Every structure is written in C-alpha cells, then in structure tokens.
Write a protein that binds this ligand. Structure first.
Ligand SMILES: *[C@@H]1O[C@H](CO)[C@@H](O[C@@H]2O[C@H](CO)[C@@H](O)[C@H](O)[C@H]2NC(C)=O)[C@H](O)[C@H]1NC(C)=O
Ligand SMILES: *[C@@H]1O[C@H](CO)[C@@H](O[C@@H]2O[C@H](CO)[C@@H](O)[C@H](O)[C@H]2NC(C)=O)[C@H](O)[C@H]1NC(C)=O
Ligand SMILES: *[C@@H]1O[C@H](CO)[C@@H](O[C@@H]2O[C@H](CO)[C@@H](O)[C@H](O)[C@H]2NC(C)=O)[C@H](O)[C@H]1NC(C)=O
Ligand SMILES: *[C@@H]1O[C@H](CO)[C@@H](O[C@@H]2O[C@H](CO)[C@@H](O)[C@H](O)[C@H]2NC(C)=O)[C@H](O)[C@H]1NC(C)=O
Ligand SMILES: *[C@@H]1O[C@H](CO)[C@@H](O)[C@H](O)[C@H]1NC(C)=O
Ligand SMILES: *[C@@H]1O[C@H](CO)[C@@H](O)[C@H](O)[C@H]1NC(C)=O
Ligand SMILES: *[C@@H]1O[C@H](CO)[C@@H](O)[C@H](O)[C@H]1NC(C)=O
Ligand SMILES: *[C@@H]1O[C@H](CO)[C@@H](O)[C@H](O)[C@H]1NC(C)=O
Lengths: 394, 394
C-alpha cells in the first residue's frame, strides 16, 4: 500500500487563500502562522456574508408580497438533506475513530520500545553488576575466569552504550496521548452537536407537515422562528465545514512535509523519514545498533556457557547465580527480538497510512457531505420560507 | 487491545438450534456439518412461515371488508426503515471491508516472510557456492584459509537447514487470497442488492404518495402489486439476515477454537497459538532458529573480516569476491532483521483482532440493523395494505 493524493484533496488545495485583507498567502499547511488563521477565517466570512445575502433575499420575498407542490418539494429536500447529513456525520466519526486508533497503536508501539530499552538497560546494569559482585569473591582465588568477568562487564557497558543510542520516545508519547484526548473531546462534542441538529431538523419537518395538517396559525410562527434559527445554524455549519475541509485537504497535500517540519527537534530527521517512508531496500538507522547488541549478547552467552561447562565442576559452591545470568541473557535476547520487531518501519508506517486514510479519505468525504447537508438544508428552508406568504393564506 | 465477547454475540449464541426435525443440534460453528447447515435453514423457514402467517393476515383484512393518519404513519415508518437500512448496509460494508483489509495485510505479511526465506536460502546456497568455487583455486596454495572456506560452507549449510525449518506459507496465501476474492464478490453483490431494495422502497413510497395525490385508481393496483413483491422480498431479507447473524455469532463466540481446528494440518499448532494469542511472556517458537541464524551470520562475517584483514594484504589476487561476500552477508543480516520483524505475533495478532472487530462488532451490528429494516418495512407495508380497503374508497 502507498499514499497518493485523491482528486478531492488536490482540487480543494487549489482554493485560493487571501486572508482578511485579500492578499495572496503561503498555501502550505502551517497552523500558528497568523496569516493562515486569517485565510481560514476568510472562508468562514464568505459563508457568513452568503448568509446575509440569503437572509435579505428571503425577507424581501416576504415583503414583495401549486403551493402544496412547493411544500412537498421542500419536505423531500429536507429529508434527503438530513439523510445525507446522517451519512456524512457517520463517515466523519469513522475517520476520527480511525485517527484515534492509529494514534493509540503508535503510542503503544513507542511505549513498548521505550519500556524494552529501559528494562534491558536497567537489568543489564543492576542485576548483572549484583551477580558479578556476588560471584567475584568465589572466583577471587583464580585469576582466569576473573579476567573473563571483567571482559563480560566491559562488553555489558558496551551494550548499555549502544542501547542508549536509541532515541527516547518519552516526549512523543505525551504528545500523542494528549492529542488523542483532545481529538476525543472534540469529536464527541461535534458528533453530539450534529446529531442534535439532525434531530431538530426532523422535528421541524414534522411540525411543518403538521402546520398544513391542522391549519393552526399559532404553530406557523413557532415553525418560522425555529426555521430561521436552524437556517442561521446551518449556514454557520456550512462555514465551519468549508474551513475544516480546506484545512484538512491542505494538510493532506503534504503530510510528509508537515510531519517532517513539526517533529524536527524532538525526533531526528533520519528515523523520521525511515518511519514515514519505510524503504524496502533497507538502510534502517537501527541496523548497526541491533547488530552490535546481538553480537554482544551471543558472545556473552558463549562465555557464560564456557563458565558453565568448565568452572562449575571446579567452583560448584555458588553456580546457581550463573544460571540466573543465563536466565537474564535469554530474557534479554527475547527482548532483543521484541525490540527489533517493534522498531521496524512496517507497523508504524501502516499506522500512519491508516491515519491518513482516516482523515484524508473518510474524514474529508464526510466533511464534504456535511457541507452538502448544510447547503441543501439552507436551500430547503429558504424555499419553505418564501413559500410561506402564500402558505398561510388558508 | 484484546478480544472480549460483546453482549449481542453471547445473546445470539443462545438462539435454539434444532434443525429440520426439531432435534437439539450442537451450537458450535461448523459450516461443514450437514446438521448445522439445516439449523441455519430452519431459521430461514421460521421467517418463511412468518411470511405465510403475515400474508394470510393482510389478505383476510382485505376480505373481511383517520385513514390519512394511518397512511402518514405508514410513510413515516417507511422513511425511518429505509434510513436504518442505509445505516445498516453501510455498517455491514464497513465490516466486510475491514475483514478484506485484515486478510490482505496478513497475506502481504505471509508473502513477505516466504519471499525473505526463499531469497535468503537461494542466495546463501547458490551465490556462496559460486563465489567459494571461484576463489578456491586462488587459495589452493595454502591449506589454511581453505579450512576457513570449509567452515564457512558448513555454517552456510547450517543456516539453510535452520531456515528450512521455518513454516511454508504457500497454501495459506492461496486460502487467504481466494477467500478475499470470494468475500469481495459476495459483498459487492449483497451491497448492490440492498441498495436496489432501498431505492425501490423509496420509489414505492413516492408512488404511494402520488396515488393519493392524483386520485388515480390504475396506480393503486401497481403500488399494491409492487408492495406485495417488496413485502415478500423483505421477509426473505429478514430470513437471510437472521440466519447470517446466528452464524456470525456462533463463529464469534469461539474464533480461536474455529481457527485452531480449521488450520490444523497445514500449520503446526504451536505457531497458530502463538499468532492467535501473542503472549509477551511465552517464548516465540522462532526464537531459537532466529538465534541460530544470527549467530551463524555473525561468525561468518567474523571469518570474512579476518580474511580481508590477512588474505587480502598477502594474496591480493581477487578481493571483489570477498567484497561481494560482504555485500551478500550485510544484505542477509538486513533480511534477518526484516524476517524477525515480520514473524512477530504483534502484526498478525493486530490483523486478527481487526478482522474480529470487523465481523463481530461492525458486521453483526449491521446485520441486526438490516434485520430491523426488514421487520419495520414488513410492518409498514402490511399496515399500508390493510389500510388500502378504506384508502381506495375515494
Ligand atoms: C499512551 O502510552 C502511555 C505509555 O507510555 C500510557 O501511559 C500509561 O497510562 C496508564 C493508564 O492511564 C497508566 O497506568 C500508566 O502509568 C501510564 N504510563 C506512563 C509511563 O505514563 C498512556 O495511557 C497511553 N495513552 C493512550 C491514549 O493510549
Ligand atoms: C537459555 O537458552 C538456551 C537455548 O535454548 C538453553 O540452552 C540449552 O540448549 C540445549 C540445546 O539447544 C537444550 O537442552 C535447551 O534448549 C537448553 N537447555 C535447557 C535446560 O533448556 C539454556 O539452558 C537456557 N538457559 C537456562 C538457564 O536454561
Ligand atoms: C496475496 O499474496 C500473493 C503473494 O504470495 C499475491 O500473489 C501475487 O500477485 C501479484 C499481483 O498480480 C502477481 O504478480 C504475483 O505473481 C503473485 N504471486 C504468486 C506467488 O501468485 C496475491 O495477489 C495477494 N492477494 C491479495 C488479495 O493481496
Ligand atoms: C558491511 O557492513 C559493515 C558494517 O557497517 C561494514 O564494515 C565497516 O564498518 C566500519 C565501522 O562500523 C565502517 O567503516 C563502515 O560501517 C563499514 N565500512 C564501509 C566501507 O562501509 C562493511 O564494509 C560492509 N560491507 C561492505 C562490502 O562494505
Ligand atoms: C511557501 O513558502 C515556501 C518556502 O518559502 C515555498 O517553497 C513555497 O513555494 C511557498 N508556497 C506558496 C503557495 O507560496
Ligand atoms: C516547515 O516550516 C518552516 C516554517 O516556515 C519552513 O521554513 C520549512 O521549510 C518547512 N519544512 C519544509 C520541509 O518545507
Ligand atoms: C458440541 O460438542 C462439543 C464436543 O463434543 C462439546 O464440548 C460442546 O459442549 C457441544 N456444544 C453444545 C452446544 O452442545
Ligand atoms: C474441531 O472440530 C472437531 C470435530 O468436531 C472437534 O473434535 C474439536 O474439538 C474442534 N476443535 C476444538 C479446538 O475444540
């Protein structure tokens, strides 16, 4: 699998950005640049002014003053709009959940790598030092096997030095978990808000049908005021959806560039590109460190086996500690296999692709469908309102 | 993440399976059992008889012979039903797509493992034999360096022997790809069929509104016949959804058991359990063979480097051969890191959990919502039909 820009993303990237004072700005995704927020704020103003133009248009129609066919058409358009809105809200929720799961999996992988490195270095320092110190006086009589103890100690120091070269993912873990919590809050509130909007739209459609059903004038004022409120709400929803869609498409155009120049200080660019691209040829930055770790572990097991074969027949007083060393080395080699499984680019690359498909493919499609909902609902309510003057003639 | 049985799965596991002759049959998921298949067939007959009872009920009502309120209620129930049906169809499609993606990624991982093993063994046999045979005559003047060549040859033999011990996933690739193609065909056809059913139901609702609108009797016969056809179709859909939901729940209760006795001959049980459970404490079955491979590779590079340090300054007859050996061994260690990354239980365990969540969590929920669609549409059309005798009074 690989990431290619879909047609909707590249087309929405072409939307011009002019900002508040209508000047060309750098189109590239860059939150925190005061020009960028103004450019996104301009798109909201376009819909806000479009609401003002629409509000005057419908009011003037009520001032300048087959009707059942227009009412039925308005109801049909409202039902189609709310159906499309339900579909779009579900799709946006799916995209946000995909992003949440991808971030959770990346957080778990980084936590696993960090825990493996920390546990391995802590064990190889503390427990190995303790056991060697305990067995040193036993081997103090014999100078050989005691040179070998120093050899093991120095190569354990080499292992710790090599392991310390691996990047620390403590900050990345915190960033990922806090951003996941933030997106959880935002997604829950947004989904609840759109569900409430859909329910209110359906209730207003039912009241609109009841108004002609019961021929009550007092209900007409309530439905009209609620329709105006829902109209302004739907125009605000259209503005928000347009801004969010253009921002998401702009980010989706250059996700690699964005991640490269956000995670530039905390994470080295070498491993950043390694995980972002996951080249199949090789050149993994961890290959040399893992090779050194595995070579050192293998030779340590060789010397410990030599101790077990020869020293135990002579110095059998306390050799269960050598068995403990063997347990330690076997567990450390299992941890080595786990570590080289985690640090591969395959899993994190799959998570990153899943996140992109969540926001670029499903999230953007859902946002576009929600914008279509907003526009269709606005048109339907405007048509219902302008048909009102001859609707209340009874 | 871990798999726990949801409430709907365990509740649907308690549906009584009695077969054709109403004899208690085992509830364990076994599509190859003739009795079990009859139990699913019995569930379809329950709805089929329920269709017969419903058909007589509505026919008798037309024989024994506010109406606009009943018609409006029927239309509202129809609209709600088709909305729920759209939601359920989308959810089932999402679940099937999740299953497709999990199977595809598992296929890719198995293909990667197989390709890595095959390439490594083919290279370590053919290229080692060729290069050593080419450089043997050069080293013919010294029995030393030839003892080393023989040692390298025997260790390459050990490497290929250890690598041959890894399981062959050729059959598993066939099974996964053919099942993915089959589920693609089935899901495409099923989604198209339900989309067509929803569209026809909406068209019939529109025609129902038009018939009362235009007061045309000739349209009433067409809407009644189409309603009867859609009624029998919806009852068949309910039968299919109930049977499929029961089968999926039966599988989802014991997925581990099902996979254990479906994949029993082609794949050994220990690795199947390792990939199904992915225990962090339990030693991986590939740990010993990967350790042997890495030890042999490191020692081989040790002898090759020793040769480069001593044979090259003295002989210098051919160095590109040893340089090619070093390229080969570096590439083989990169392949080793890739192999130990792929064979970890983490990736395939995540794939299996994703597939389970696709069919157990999303697929079954979508199927239940489609069954709700079928029942609601049947009730709505029955109510519309029984209101017809006083509807056509004009
Ligand atoms: C992201 O991973 C970190 C681990 O680095 C998780 O932090 C742990 O969270 C659990 C549950 O809250 C605590 O019991 C641990 O003490 C935490 N460990 C550390 C080192 O802080 C974190 O919960 C994960 N976040 C998400 C959203 O999955
Ligand atoms: C650590 O693992 C090694 C490798 O398995 C153990 O070495 C023994 O190897 C022989 C032949 O491969 C077999 O008897 C067993 O695989 C191992 N012995 C036992 C008793 O399991 C080594 O023993 C392990 N460490 C300890 C303390 O047992
Ligand atoms: C499952 O993996 C196998 C590889 O083991 C894929 O088979 C290859 O497909 C490509 C694409 O046409 C062919 O060029 C190769 O010749 C195939 N190899 C073999 C050995 O048949 C298969 O396409 C994969 N299926 C899915 C659905 O991903
Ligand atoms: C295969 O990889 C090894 C390990 O990197 C190469 O050995 C050299 O190691 C030293 C110290 O780490 C460095 O100069 C380079 O990493 C390696 N040398 C070169 C010239 O790259 C070994 O050279 C590699 N094989 C070949 C044929 O270059
Ligand atoms: C934004 O600025 C960067 C660097 O100055 C430049 O490479 C890029 O072309 C600019 N893009 C636009 C749309 O101005
Ligand atoms: C990241 O943003 C900075 C800030 O303007 C910019 O200078 C840099 O070029 C960007 N990174 C890339 C790869 O363009
Ligand atoms: C099915 O058979 C197995 C083995 O005979 C048994 O353990 C299980 O309880 C049976 N299931 C039912 C529902 O009787
Ligand atoms: C698989 O099916 C056989 C035959 O019915 C049964 O004996 C066995 O118990 C099943 N597998 C498991 C793990 O129970």
């Amino acid at each position: 699998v690989d990431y290619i820009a879909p047609w909707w993303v590249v087309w929405l990237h072409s939307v011009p950005h002019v900002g508040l004072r209508l000047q060309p700005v750098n189109s590239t995704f860059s939150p925190g640049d005061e020009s960028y927020q103004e450019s996104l704020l301009f798109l909201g103003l376009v819909a806000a002014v479009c609401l003002g133009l629409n509000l005057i248009f419908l009011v003037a129609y009520l001032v300048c003053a087959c009707i059942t066919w227009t009412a039925v058409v308005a109801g049909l358009i409202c039902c189609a709009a709310v159906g499309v809105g339900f579909y779009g809200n579900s799709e946006t929720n799916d995209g946000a959940y995909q992003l949440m799961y991808s971030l959770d999996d990346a957080n778990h992988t980084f936590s696993g790598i960090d825990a493996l490195v920390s546990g391995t270095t802590q064990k190889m320092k503390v427990d190995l030092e303790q056991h060697l110190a305990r067995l040193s006086e036993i081997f103090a009589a014999r100078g050989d096997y005691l040179q070998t103890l120093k050899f093991i100690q120095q190569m354990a120091g080499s292992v710790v030095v090599q392991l310390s070269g691996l990047p620390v993912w403590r900050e990345v873990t915190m960033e990922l978990t806090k951003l996941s919590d933030q997106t959880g809050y935002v997604e829950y509130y947004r989904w609840l808000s759109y569900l409430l909007l859909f329910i209110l739209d359906l209730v207003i459609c039912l009241i609109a049908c009841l108004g002609l059903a019961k021929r009550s004038k007092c209900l007409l004022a309530s439905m009209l005021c609620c329709g105006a409120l829902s109209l302004l709400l739907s125009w605000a929803s259209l503005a928000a959806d347009g801004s969010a869609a253009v921002a998401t498409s702009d980010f989706c155009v250059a996700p690699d560039t964005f991640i490269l120049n956000v995670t530039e200080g905390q994470i080295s660019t070498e491993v950043t590109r390694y995980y972002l691209y996951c080249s199949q040829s090789g050149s993994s930055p961890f290959q040399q460190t893992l090779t050194t770790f595995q070579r050192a572990l293998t030779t340590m097991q060789i010397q410990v086996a030599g101790l077990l074969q020869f020293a135990v027949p002579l110095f059998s007083t306390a050799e269960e500690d050598l068995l403990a060393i063997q347990l330690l080395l076997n567990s450390s080699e299992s941890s080595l296999h786990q570590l080289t499984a985690m640090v591969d680019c395959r899993g994190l690359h799959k998570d990153y692709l899943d996140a992109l498909a969540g926001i670029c493919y499903d999230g953007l499609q859902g946002l576009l469908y929600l914008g279509l909902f907003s526009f269709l609902a606005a048109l339907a309510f405007s048509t219902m309102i302008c048909a009102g003057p001859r609707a209340w003639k009874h």
